[PDB]
Amino acid sequence: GHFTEEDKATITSLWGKVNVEDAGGETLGRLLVVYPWTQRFFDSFGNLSSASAIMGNPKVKAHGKKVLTSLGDAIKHLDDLKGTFAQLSELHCDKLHVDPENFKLLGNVLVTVLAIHFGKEFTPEVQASWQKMVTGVASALSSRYH
Amino acid sequence: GHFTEEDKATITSLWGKVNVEDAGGETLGRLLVVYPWTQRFFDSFGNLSSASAIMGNPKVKAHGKKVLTSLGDAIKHLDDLKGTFAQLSELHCDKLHVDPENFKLLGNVLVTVLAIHFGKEFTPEVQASWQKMVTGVASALSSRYH
Amino acid sequence: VLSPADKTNVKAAWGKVGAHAGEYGAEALERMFLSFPTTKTYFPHFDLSHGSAQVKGHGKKVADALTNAVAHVDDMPNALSALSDLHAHKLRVDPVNFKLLSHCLLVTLAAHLPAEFTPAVHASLDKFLASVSTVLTSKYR
Amino acid sequence: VLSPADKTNVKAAWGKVGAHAGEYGAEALERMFLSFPTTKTYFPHFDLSHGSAQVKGHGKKVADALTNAVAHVDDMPNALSALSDLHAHKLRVDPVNFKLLSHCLLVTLAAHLPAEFTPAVHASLDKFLASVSTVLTSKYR
Ligand code: HEM
Ligand code: HEM
Ligand code: HEM
Ligand code: HEM
């Protein structure tokens, strides 16, 4: 509605450890596989048929990082994510036609990929900070649908 | 995030026609019957066993109106529902322990009872204004859970 | 699971709809689009101007699949099969949305059967629509 | 519906849990309470201080019902019957919440099998947990 400094110091350092290019190819990859109807917006992309063809598809790997860098950058204006994503929101509604329900779906695959990567370092209290973040990002990306 | 004047003029007049005491005994009554696990917070109340024993139970009829009048009054500060319900929110969390998911469930039974009552007068555009209202009320009632 | 008091209830309520069904079906949709603009994204190729044949046509199609489902309430999964196949693989509408159209339908029905819409029936109907939503969401993953 | 590649996957992932299960089960819960304080309302009689035997005990109970479910993945509804009866009539936890605990479990598992947690397995597991959630939500209305 927002965050405690112990919160934000938290998502800030876990993130300085993240290799964005590779963690993004992973969440977008797993989003397509666990919730296969997200496949929906991407047959411009090629072989999307077995969990293996997808985790290895380079177009997936690429937009995966495009998305995540779009996100790394908002980590920086945690104070007004709505202002940070207003243009990307207008665009996903008016031109891409993405059910914003997907931002939530991806927000959750991402908390999952972060747990996989950092194991015990990703403690319940650190997840909570990121559940707040992922939720606020999905919320700001959807602020302008109509 | 809020409302157009054509919106608010709309929920305002449909409501001047509502007999609160009787429309509230109805939605709370139908909430208990359609989503029977809401029964959960009320066996201080008696026979809650057949759809007929419930729509006729007077304790239900009573708190039904208590709830709805609590709501009629917020129709008046549509501008800051969060400030209007902060005390009722703190109370439903700290003392009553109600899964706020219920406010949404009741918000929807209520749009339904309004459609039943006003028939064709309750047009898609008028429902939309009230979906905004019911959603903002559920949102303000939950603003303070922890 | 639908009890049989449930089936008696859905059959009798939908019987009163009889032929206004494509009509109630087009109305449900207008209400979904206006009340939950988010559902709009699955229809960029439609003219959603109120009264356009595109939506009037889709609603007769949706009300008809529903009538077919009420006619087969005991063997529903097989009856809505090709449709489960459709939404699941070509269309892929996120399931959070079936909950949404299901509700505007509950609402469109509440506003037209001043009173066939009994609380006991309001319940069997929400229940019936949740079953249809589930069969259609079934072969997704 | 769980394919059988799904069952092979859930059986092998939960096998690695074997005995840390009451442990992973108590951790899932702490994460639900912290990440979704709203789930707290079903537990006013618990001390949710981190490490309290009340939550450690509930988690062994929850992980155990889960182990029993994986052992009966083909006859699940009958196996989780008394439990479906429980939550449904005494407890009555709103079903929106099964989606929540299901996710913290997905997450607790992701953080402990550095890598048994394959994307293909991450999928069968989300899938398995949604099935358990559905059987338990079954006799509600
Ligand atoms: C984490 C939240 C997300 C962020 C921050 C994000 C950001 C972006 C950005 C910056 C672009 C480039 C837009 C441009 O061309 O200027 C983009 C494109 C796109 N995104 Fe989103 N995205 C997110 C989630 C999603 C989700 C969940 C989906 C679908 C499930 C999606 C599907 C797409 C598609 C299809 C494109 C177009 C790519 C193309 O033109 O080839 N994005 N996204
Ligand atoms: C439309 C949103 C709602 C509003 C505005 C509302 C308002 C209120 C108010 C003003 C009270 C009296 C509190 C006091 O004693 O001072 C109350 C009590 C209560 N409400 Fe809420 N309520 C709402 C929804 C709900 C829902 C959805 C439930 C359960 C599903 C619920 C369950 C209760 C219970 C159990 C009490 C205590 C009654 C008693 O002490 O006997 N309310 N509500
Ligand atoms: C009550 C549940 C629903 C039923 C029974 C239903 C039924 C149908 C039927 C029968 C068709 C046409 C099939 C054909 O062409 O042969 C259709 C098409 C379609 N439906 Fe579903 N539907 C339901 C819910 C939804 C929802 C929630 C959405 C998402 C907002 C949706 C989006 C679509 C779309 C995009 C089409 C494509 C129609 C076209 O090609 O123009 N439907 N639906
Ligand atoms: C993964 C799905 C779940 C499983 C397998 C599960 C299993 C169980 C089991 C086995 C019990 C004890 C039964 C007994 O006493 O014999 C229990 C109790 C309970 N569970 Fe469920 N549960 C699940 C999800 C939930 C959810 C989502 C909630 C709501 C937040 C919840 C709330 C409770 C409560 C309040 C109790 C009472 C325990 C007590 O008496 O202290 N459970 N659960």
Side-chain angles (χ1 to χ4, degrees):
Chain A
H2 72 198
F3 350 56
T4 64
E5 280 331 294
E6 230 27 36
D7 264 34
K8 171 187 178 190
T10 278
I11 82 141
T12 259
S13 85
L14 199 249
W15 196 258
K17 293 197 214 181
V18 172
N19 164 355
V20 166
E21 276 17 275
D22 125 348
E26 252 260 280
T27 38
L28 185 52
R30 282 163 121 97
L31 159 88
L32 266 19
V33 167
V34 168
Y35 304 112
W37 58 89
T38 37
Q39 225 138 122
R40 194 176 200 262
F41 309 100
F42 317 98
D43 45 33
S44 175
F45 291 19
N47 213 168
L48 272 205
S49 46
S50 50
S52 265
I54 71 168
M55 301 298 331
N57 184 307
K59 238 120 186 175
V60 159
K61 262 173 185 161
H63 166 70
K65 141 220 183 169
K66 185 150 189 173
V67 147
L68 236 262
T69 326
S70 147
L71 176 118
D73 282 17
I75 282 290
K76 304 203 182 184
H77 313 91
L78 239 26
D79 270 314
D80 129 87
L81 296 163
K82 272 181 178 179
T84 308
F85 286 110
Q87 178 116 94
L88 265 183
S89 173
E90 161 183 326
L91 178 91
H92 274 87
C93 186
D94 298 354
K95 300 301 181 181
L96 296 182
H97 316 298
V98 182
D99 180 2
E101 170 62 17
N102 291 134
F103 304 144
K104 295 177 183 168
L105 269 192
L106 175 87
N108 286 349
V109 160
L110 177 82
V111 158
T112 274
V113 151
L114 281 180
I116 306 143
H117 177 93
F118 296 102
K120 63 164 180 152
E121 232 201 292
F122 193 70
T123 63
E125 240 71 299
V126 166
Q127 161 190 346
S129 280
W130 282 95
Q131 279 283 180
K132 275 173 167 181
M133 223 269 163
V134 138
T135 289
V137 147
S139 213
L141 261 202
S142 82
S143 307
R144 285 187 182 185
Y145 269 62
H146 59 163
Chain B
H2 72 198
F3 350 56
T4 64
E5 280 331 294
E6 230 28 36
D7 264 34
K8 171 187 178 190
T10 278
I11 82 141
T12 259
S13 85
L14 199 249
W15 196 258
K17 293 197 214 181
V18 172
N19 164 355
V20 166
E21 276 17 275
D22 125 348
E26 252 260 280
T27 38
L28 185 52
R30 282 163 121 97
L31 159 88
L32 266 19
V33 167
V34 168
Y35 304 112
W37 58 89
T38 37
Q39 225 138 122
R40 194 176 200 262
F41 309 100
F42 317 98
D43 45 33
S44 175
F45 291 19
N47 213 168
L48 272 205
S49 46
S50 50
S52 265
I54 71 168
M55 301 298 331
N57 184 307
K59 238 120 186 175
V60 159
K61 262 173 185 161
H63 166 70
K65 141 220 183 169
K66 185 150 189 173
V67 147
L68 236 262
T69 326
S70 147
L71 176 118
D73 282 17
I75 282 290
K76 304 203 182 184
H77 313 91
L78 239 26
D79 270 314
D80 129 87
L81 296 163
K82 271 181 178 179
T84 308
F85 286 110
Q87 178 116 94
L88 265 183
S89 173
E90 161 183 326
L91 178 91
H92 274 86
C93 186
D94 298 354
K95 300 301 181 181
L96 296 182
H97 316 298
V98 182
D99 180 2
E101 170 62 17
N102 291 134
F103 304 144
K104 295 177 183 168
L105 269 192
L106 175 87
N108 287 349
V109 160
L110 177 82
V111 158
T112 274
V113 151
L114 281 180
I116 306 143
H117 177 93
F118 296 102
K120 63 164 180 152
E121 232 201 292
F122 193 70
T123 63
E125 239 71 299
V126 166
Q127 161 190 346
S129 280
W130 282 95
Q131 279 283 180
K132 275 173 167 181
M133 223 269 163
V134 138
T135 289
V137 147
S139 213
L141 261 202
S142 82
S143 307
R144 285 187 182 186
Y145 269 62
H146 59 163
Chain C
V1 178
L2 331 220
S3 77
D6 267 339
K7 313 164 179 166
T8 299
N9 278 351
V10 168
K11 271 145 187 181
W14 199 258
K16 230 288 195 175
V17 170
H20 294 278
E23 222 188 273
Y24 291 174
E27 179 176 324
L29 297 164
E30 187 165 338
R31 314 186 158 263
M32 198 189 42
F33 297 141
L34 283 184
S35 298
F36 305 116
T38 145
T39 60
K40 269 173 181 178
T41 63
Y42 291 102
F43 296 88
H45 53 310
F46 274 36
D47 148 41
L48 311 181
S49 36
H50 162 56
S52 71
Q54 229 154 0
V55 157
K56 269 186 176 182
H58 180 56
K60 168 174 184 179
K61 254 158 180 181
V62 157
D64 272 347
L66 238 28
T67 277
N68 169 56
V70 160
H72 302 281
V73 88
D74 274 321
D75 196 61
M76 274 214 276
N78 329 120
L80 288 187
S81 214
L83 236 19
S84 14
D85 265 5
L86 180 49
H87 286 80
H89 310 314
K90 177 162 191 197
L91 306 184
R92 316 145 157 140
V93 163
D94 190 282
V96 147
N97 304 109
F98 279 89
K99 151 207 169 183
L100 292 200
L101 183 224
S102 263
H103 171 253
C104 300
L105 220 93
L106 218 39
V107 165
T108 290
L109 248 33
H112 284 292
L113 308 173
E116 321 255 5
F117 200 78
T118 264
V121 164
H122 164 179
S124 275
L125 273 172
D126 172 69
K127 216 137 98 173
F128 157 76
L129 287 168
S131 265
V132 156
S133 289
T134 286
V135 140
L136 292 175
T137 253
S138 260
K139 317 173 156 167
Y140 268 48
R141 74 190 204 189
Chain D
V1 178
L2 331 220
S3 77
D6 266 339
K7 313 164 179 166
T8 299
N9 278 351
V10 168
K11 271 145 187 181
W14 199 258
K16 230 288 195 175
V17 170
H20 294 278
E23 222 188 273
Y24 291 174
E27 179 176 324
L29 297 164
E30 187 165 338
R31 314 186 158 263
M32 198 189 42
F33 297 141
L34 283 184
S35 298
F36 305 116
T38 145
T39 60
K40 269 173 181 178
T41 63
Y42 291 102
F43 296 88
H45 53 310
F46 274 35
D47 148 41
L48 311 181
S49 36
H50 162 56
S52 71
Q54 229 154 0
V55 157
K56 269 186 176 182
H58 180 56
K60 168 174 184 179
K61 254 158 180 181
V62 157
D64 272 347
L66 238 28
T67 277
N68 169 56
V70 160
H72 302 281
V73 88
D74 274 321
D75 196 61
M76 274 214 276
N78 329 120
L80 288 187
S81 214
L83 236 19
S84 14
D85 265 5
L86 180 49
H87 286 80
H89 310 314
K90 177 162 191 197
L91 306 184
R92 316 145 157 140
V93 163
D94 190 282
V96 148
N97 304 109
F98 279 89
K99 151 207 169 183
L100 292 200
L101 183 224
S102 263
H103 171 253
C104 300
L105 220 93
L106 218 39
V107 165
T108 290
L109 248 33
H112 284 292
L113 308 173
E116 321 255 5
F117 199 77
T118 264
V121 164
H122 164 179
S124 275
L125 273 172
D126 172 69
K127 216 137 98 173
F128 157 76
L129 287 168
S131 266
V132 156
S133 289
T134 286
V135 140
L136 292 175
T137 253
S138 260
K139 317 173 156 167
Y140 268 48
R141 74 189 204 189

